[PDB]
Nucleic acid binder design. Sequence first.
RNA 1: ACGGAAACUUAAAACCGUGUUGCACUGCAACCCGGAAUUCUUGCACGUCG
Length: 49
Amino acid sequence: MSQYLKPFELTLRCLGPVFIGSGEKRTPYVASTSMVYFPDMERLYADVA
RNA sequence: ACGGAAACUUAAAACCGUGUUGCACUGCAACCCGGAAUUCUUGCACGUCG
């Protein structure tokens, strides 16, 4: 390394959930009893023929 | 009344005619617009719930 600079590390274990906003929103996803199906939007236009 | 006295050495005629200061000749040969400079340093997607 160098003489002015050493490396270091730290612990980061979350116990509660982690949410940092990024200006992005999900909109009608499937809000049902057992499945929240987040699909691929690219494949829904492959039966045009 | 002196071998005396009178008389222009005179008239016209172009030193002119033919003739290039001309012919051959690179303003040419050689070179880098070239070397050294961080687009960077401060910065949490969050306050807010009868």
